[PDB]
């Protein structure tokens, strides 16, 4: 069936961000529906979201997503 | 100067409105500014405002508006 497996076996830079916004509306991962059966959202990584969203070295590993929606 | 005068000396229909809206956003008389000196709004009549705004025989009289904005 639906199987997810992730293995991480580890045997063994200036970033300046400046923002100045008077008004800001930010939407990240958004799923919108009126009539649906399944609305599954799977997050294995990063969904860093904001007016000044900064992501630095977020997803650096074994990630597995298995979805069997429907049937 | 600024003078307003109104005199009303009175010496002596089926209206069916049906509305069906799932979502409604209604704005009537709206004045929007970021930097202004005067923002005067004068109402002598009717500003009937709504999702199902109905006006029937509203302004039937002597109405006077005198505005001396500025100078």
Author numbering:
A (entry chain B), B (entry chain A): 14 to 25, 36 to 94
From the paper:
The aggregation of aSyn into insoluble amyloid fibrils is related to the pathogenesis of different synucleinopathies, albeit in ways that are not fully understood. Several variants of aSyn have been linked to familial forms of PD and include, for example, A53T, V15A, A30G, A30P, E46K, H50Q, G51D, A53E, A53V and T72M, highlighting the importance of aSyn in PD.
In cryo-EM micrographs, WT aSyn fibrils appeared well dispersed facilitating their structural analysis. Further 2D classification demonstrated that wide fibrils consisted of two protofilaments (2PF), while narrow fibrils contained only one (1PF). 3D reconstruction was successful only for the 2PF polymorph, converging to a map of 2·7 Å resolution, which allowed building an atomic model. In contrast, lateral association of WT fibrils was minimal, and two protofilament fibrils were also abundant. Although 3D reconstruction of WT 1 PF fibrils was not successful (see above), comparison of 3D classes between G14R and WT 1 PF fibrils revealed their similarity.
